[PDB]
Each structure stands twice: as structure tokens, then as C-alpha cells.
Write an enzyme that holds these catalytic residues in place. Structure first.
Site, PDB file in Angstrom:
ATOM      1  CG  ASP A 230      -1.557  -0.871   1.053  1.00 19.90           C
ATOM      2  OD1 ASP A 230      -2.533  -0.409  -0.148  1.00 19.90           O
ATOM      3  OD2 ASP A 230      -3.438  -0.816   1.904  1.00 19.90           O
TER       4      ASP A 230
ATOM      5  CB  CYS B 230      -0.582   0.954 -12.078  1.00 14.44           C
ATOM      6  SG  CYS B 230       0.661   1.095 -12.866  1.00 14.44           S
TER       7      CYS B 230
ATOM      8  NE  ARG C 172       0.746  -0.070  -8.190  1.00 12.21           N
ATOM      9  CZ  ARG C 172      -0.462   0.294  -7.079  1.00 12.21           C
ATOM     10  NH1 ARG C 172       0.068  -0.431  -6.431  1.00 12.21           N
ATOM     11  NH2 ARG C 172      -1.836   0.778  -6.902  1.00 12.21           N
ATOM     12  CB  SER C 173       2.110   0.679 -15.194  1.00 14.09           C
ATOM     13  OG  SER C 173       2.128   1.415 -14.700  1.00 14.09           O
TER      14      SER C 173
ATOM     15  CD  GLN D 199       3.695   8.915 -10.251  1.00 16.45           C
ATOM     16  OE1 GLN D 199       2.210   8.402 -10.246  1.00 16.45           O
ATOM     17  NE2 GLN D 199       3.591   9.071 -10.960  1.00 16.45           N
TER      18      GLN D 199
END
Length: 278
Positions: free
Chosen positions: A177, A211, A217-218, A258
Site C-alpha cells: 500500500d 496499475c 508501478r507499471s 512516481q
């Protein structure tokens, strides 16, 4: 080496701050059009017009997806946002038109008590989905629920031509998370599983990675992948610069990676993966 030098000096956040500013900026006019207001999950994550995936839809060809074409590595990916309740039809249209083989979901439908994306795929084989707007039908054939991920063999049938197509759904279900995976081992393993299937091989259209925003994440998946691939076709780890490869991908889509935290992970994953695929 470079990673070690950065770590001891904790210069990570600055390194990232630098990448974030070196990155290319290109128009996203189509994305920002009012008629596409509801075809976008986030206001701050849009597909550059030059690389946006256009639907072969005479109506409105907007889908928040970008084609990241990695020339040297000879690998293409299609980064997209998690399908919105109203865009699952378009998502499957794209997958059909781009002749994609695999679909990489690097998120859970609900994370942090919030729904991060739509249930665009059937959960029970007895109840298949039919995307009216795009005239496509989707069916669950099988799945392998594992510890840190799940492979699902779906079947997408173009209802217009009654033509069927086997699609593979690689679902990474253990991405924290907050933070990033404690160790690359499982991520790399998921990456390699994606690789073995052939969904990442040239005999198919680009893999649709996603994602929620479909950048954090991608972005990590693709960077790790490409870096490992170049490092492989050169068998010369030395010439493979993660920073340069990332920036290179950024010409095709915004905000891949990110946080400086994810960037560090990318280094870890790539380095760890080199102890095999190189």
C-alpha cells in the site's frame, strides 16, 4: 556500484528530483478535451498526443493509453490507467486492435480502502462479460491464484467477426500500500513469468501494462524489463544506464515511476535480475 555511491550519500531523492525535471513534456490536447473528461481516471496523468493509443473507433478514439516504443531493446509496451466503469469496453477494444497478448495488472481493484480500478475481467467462468459499446465478449477460462500473483487465461471474442483470441492476465497482487516491495525477488519473478508466456515477445502486439494511474508501478515493470533486455543483447551491464532508459521512456508517457523510492527499487530489481538474464 552507482547504486552504492547514491545510497551511502542518500542522494536518491535528488537524483529523482533531477530525473523529474529532465523529463520531456509534450501536448495532451486530446486528453484534455471536454468530450474525454470522463474517459480519464486522473487529471494529472494524461497520454501525450504524439504517443496516445487511438481506438479504431470512428466515434471517439480516446483511451488513456500510451505506446512506449523501445527501439534498441526492440520492445513495445502500452501503459494505461485502470479501466473506469465506463471504459472497460474501450480497454478491451484497444487490446483487440493492438493485437495484444498479455495484460499486466500491477494493482488490486481496491487498495487503501479505495477502489483503484474497475473489475473489467470475469471472476467466474460461468458468467462472462459482454462489452456492448465495443461489441466484444470476455470469458474466464482458468486462473492460477498464487502467493504473490495470479495468471488468468481469458478469451476475448470479437462479437462482430465471431473471432476468438486468447488473452493472458498477469496479476501482481502483493505490491504494498505504501512503499515498494521489500525485495525485488517476487517482482522479478512475476516479470519473468510474464516473459515466459510470450506475451512480451515480438510475435504479438504490445503488452497492456497498468496499475491505477498506470505510471508508478507499471513504469517500474517496463524499466526493469527494458534495462534487463538491453543489458542482455549487449551482455554488457556497464553500458546500461537506468537513468537514461527511464528518461527515454518518458518521451512516451508521463510520470513513469512516481517516487524516488520506486526508482531505488528499479535499480535493485535490475541489478538483481542481472544475476541471471545477463
Amino acid at each position: 556500484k552507482e547504486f552504492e555511491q547514491i545510497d551511502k550519500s542518500g542522494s536518491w531523492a535528488a537524483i529523482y528530483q533531477d530525473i523529474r525535471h529532465e523529463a520531456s513534456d509534450f501536448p495532451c490536447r486530446v486528453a484534455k478535451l471536454p468530450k474525454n473528461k470522463n474517459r480519464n481516471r486522473y487529471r494529472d496523468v494524461s497520454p501525450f498526443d504524439h504517443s496516445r493509443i487511438k481506438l479504431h473507433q470512428e466515434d471517439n478514439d480516446y483511451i488513456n493509453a500510451s505506446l512506449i516504443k523501445m527501439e534498441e531493446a526492440q520492445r513495445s509496451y502500452i501503459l494505461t490507467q485502470g479501466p473506469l466503469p465506463n471504459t472497460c469496453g474501450h480497454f478491451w477494444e484497444m487490446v483487440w486492435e493492438q493485437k495484444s497478448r498479455g495484460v499486466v495488472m500491477l494493482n488490486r481493484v481496491m487498495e487503501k480502502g479505495s477502489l483503484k480500478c474497475a473489475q473489467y475481467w470475469p471472476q467466474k467462468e460461468e458468467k462472462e462479460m459482454i462489452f456492448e459499446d465495443t461489441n466484444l465478449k470476455l470469458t474466464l477460462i482458468s486462473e492460477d491464484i498464487k502467493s504473490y500473483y495470479t495468471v488468468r487465461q481469458l478469451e476475448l471474442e470479437n462479437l462482430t467477426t465471431q473471432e476468438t483470441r486468447e488473452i493472458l492476465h498477469f496479476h501482481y497482487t502483493t505490491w504494498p500500500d505504501f512503499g515498494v516491495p521489500e525485495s525485488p525477488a517476487s517482482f522479478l519473478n512475476f516479470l519473468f513469468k510474464v516473459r515466459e508466456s510470450g506475451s512480451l515477445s515480438p510475435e504479438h502486439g504490445p503488452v497492456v501494462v497498468h496499475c491505477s494511474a498506470g505510471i508508478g508501478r507499471s513504469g517500474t515493470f517496463c524499466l526493469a524489463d527494458t534495462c534487463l533486455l538491453l543489458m542482455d543483447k549487449r551482455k554488457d551491464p556497464s553500458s546500461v544506464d537506468i537513468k537514461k532508459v527511464l528518461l527515454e521512456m518518458r518521451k512516451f508517457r508521463m510520470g513513469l515511476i512516481q517516487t524516488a523510492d520506486q526508482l531505488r527499487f528499479s535499480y535493485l530489481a535490475v541489478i538483481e535480475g542481472a544475476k541471471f538474464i545477463m
